[PDB]
């Protein structure tokens, strides 16, 4: 909005940007009545009394070809008074700062949802740079033409008289509070805005001109950053050599920085990870077979890079970032920093594969920072509230004590700041290792919501072994088929009252989470399958799997890589495998039981813990959510 003060003493000169509201003040400097006459290019909506509440608004149809090429003449008059004119010389210009605010096709507010508005900005956190180590957004150069594919286009369209920028100048700027989070390049690329440059005078010729910019974000939404970046163009009147520049017009574009998003087990797999180059090759054969069946790329981290760290699940989580112009996978690199420390940075980050990390990197970390403790539900609607990308799930204690663990707060805060998968804390700290993947998994299903929640279940396994005993198999041996292990009979397992007490307490820990998941994910019992599973309490009364933890499985669409439990063999078959098959095969799932005993199981993890998976991003666009 602008209010131009017109005067009979002096003619006034003014610029009018198309799309702006221009009013006249006729009264303040008048000498009883007035009339207005203007050139055809000016539409004056409002003969009239010289009264202060008379709203006179000027509208201009097109950009001026010359400065002052439109005129307004206000003739004041009275009963005995010959007319007195005031002159206003107008120059109209077009100043449009443009971005993809409809989110398909290149107010000043970023709004969520399908009817919303606001452009998207990607954190430029991959490495298209040929033989480099850094993320692309770390320097202030565009070093590759394909890097620009990651960036957001913004264009300044101007239409002015040929001499307009003799006396006016345009400046592009970003608030100092946001300059550290964005970098803007001008294309014909050189930086115009960025971490030490909050403003830049644009060099723009008169007439019609179009100037393209490319914008990269430098930081993910976080505690300290809601995720919005505003870029502003200001038109400055520099007509007076003995006076400071005066702002004539400002316009803005607001971008939202795209969140980091995880993919549930119900998303189709694209690539499997194992770092199974260590001591054993038959585990690796099985997962390789499964990957083939599932049509996945397969990548393996060798012993020389492993440093004997076999837990491919724990050091990273492969998510993605998504904009209308570009979607790419992005590895969240856990601070756990064991043998696999370098793998995400050296082997997973690369062209069109982004990187993020959080938390302290040389200590101050726990087991619950391992990303076996970081999972995500399938899409879910909870008491009317839709969660179309699911809800992040991570394990905690039920209350903080001297002996309890949590995922580091920096990680927790980063996940919640990616508002999109509204995290839910579960209770995993009762486990020795402490990971949600030790008691839950999700698998696809053809009916009802499209998945099942699988939970480890001591109840189910006691039921199974009791039925087997009732049918005369009390002598059948748990751990049949194992070289070096105490074989144990079903009857002695059942009669062990301390084992029963242990598993009763575990059942209680899992049941707490069952009801938590039910509330927070809106699940019914019909969404849930119990997988027969025994545990034992050991050091600090922390729970460990009694036999291979079958819930800690690899889910490759309908192909499942389930730890081989080595259960009692009844009518030629392990009754545990048999039970699991009877539960999952009716869903169309194919269960492969993988020997992981002396390589994973014995070192406190199973198939899921020794592998990782990159999965297809959701088709649903995160910005269409209303978090």
């Amino acid at each position: 909005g602008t209010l131009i003060r017109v005067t009979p003493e002096q003619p006034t000169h003014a610029v009018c940007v198309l799309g702006t509201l221009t009013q006249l003040d006729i009264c303040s400097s008048a000498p009883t009545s007035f009339s207005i006459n203007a050139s055809p290019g000016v539409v004056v909506d409002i003969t009239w009394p010289l009264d202060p509440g008379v709203e006179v608004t000027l509208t201009m149809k097109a950009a001026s070809g010359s400065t002052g090429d439109q005129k307004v003449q206000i003739s004041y008059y009275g009963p005995k008074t010959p007319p007195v004119k005031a002159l206003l010389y107008l120059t109209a210009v077009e100043i449009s700062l443009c971005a993809d605010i409809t989110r398909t096709g290149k107010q000043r507010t970023w709004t969520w949802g399908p009817c919303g508005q606001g452009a998207i900005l990607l954190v430029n956190c991959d490495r298209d740079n040929l033989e480099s180590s850094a993320m692309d957004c770390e320097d202030d150069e565009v070093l590759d033409s394909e890097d620009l594919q990651d960036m957001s286009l913004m264009t300044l369209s101007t239409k002015t008289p040929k001499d307009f920028f003799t006396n006016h100048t345009l400046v592009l700027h970003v608030a100092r509070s946001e300059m550290d989070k964005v970098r803007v390049f001008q294309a014909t690329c050189s930086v115009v805005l960025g971490p030490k440059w909050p403003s830049h005078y644009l060099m723009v010729p008169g007439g019609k001109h179009n100037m393209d910019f490319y914008v990269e974000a430098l930081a993910f939404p976080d505690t300290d950053f809601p995720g919005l970046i505003t870029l502003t163009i200001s038109l400055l009147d520099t007509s007076n050599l003995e006076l400071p520049e005066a702002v004539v017009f400002q316009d803005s574009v607001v971008f939202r920085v795209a969140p980091w998003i995880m993919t549930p087990n119900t998303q189709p797999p694209q690539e499997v990870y194992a770092c199974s180059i260590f001591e054993n090759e038959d585990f690796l054969k099985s997962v390789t077979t499964l990957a083939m069946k599932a049509k996945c790329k397969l990548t393996i981290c060798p012993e020389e890079e492993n440093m004997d760290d076999q837990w491919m699940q724990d050091e990273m989580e492969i998510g993605y970032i998504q904009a209308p112009h570009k979607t790419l996978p992005v590895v969240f690199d856990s601070p756990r920093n064991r043998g696999l420390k370098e793998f995400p940075i050296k082997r997973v980050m690369g062209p069109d594969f982004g990187y993020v990390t959080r938390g302290p990197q040389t200590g101050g970390i726990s087991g619950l920072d391992s990303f076996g403790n970081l999972e995500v539900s399938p899409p879910v609607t909870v008491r009317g509230k839709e969660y179309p990308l699911g809800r992040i799930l991570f394990g905690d204690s039920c209350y903080p004590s001297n002996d309890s663990r949590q995922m580091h707060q920096a990680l927790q805060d980063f996940l919640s700041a990616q508002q999109v998968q509204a995290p839910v804390k579960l209770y995993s700290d009762w486990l020795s290792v402490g990971h949600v993947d030790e008691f839950l998994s999700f698998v696809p299903a053809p009916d009802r919501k499209g998945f099942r929640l699988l939970l480890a279940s001591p109840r189910s396994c006691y039921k199974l072994f009791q039925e087997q005993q009732n049918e005369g198999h009390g002598e059948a041996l748990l751990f049949e088929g194992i070289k070096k292990k105490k074989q144990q009979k079903i009857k002695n397992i059942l009669s062990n009252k301390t084992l029963r007490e242990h598993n009763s307490f575990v059942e209680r820990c899992i049941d707490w989470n069952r009801e938590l998941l039910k509330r927070e994910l809106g699940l019914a019992e019909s969404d849930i399958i119990d997988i027969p599973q025994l545990f034992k309490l050991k050091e600090f009364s922390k729970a460990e799997a009694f036999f291979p933890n079958m819930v800690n499985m690899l889910v490759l669409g309908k192909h499942l890589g389930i730890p081989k439990p080595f259960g009692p063999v009844i009518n030629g078959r392990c009754c545990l495998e048999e039970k699991v098959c009877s539960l999952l095969e009716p869903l169309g799932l194919q269960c492969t039981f993988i020997n992981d005993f002396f390589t994973y199981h014995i070192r406190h993890g199973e198939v899921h813990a020794g592998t990782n998976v990159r999965r297809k991003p959701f088709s649903f666009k995160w910005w269409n959510m209303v978090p």
Binding site: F278, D308, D309, Q310, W311, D314, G339, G367, S370, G372, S432, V433, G434, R603, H604, G605, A609
Partner: peptide, 5 residues
């Protein structure tokens, strides 16, 4: 290489 430490 225990999963825990």
């Amino acid at each position: 290489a225990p999963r825990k430490q």
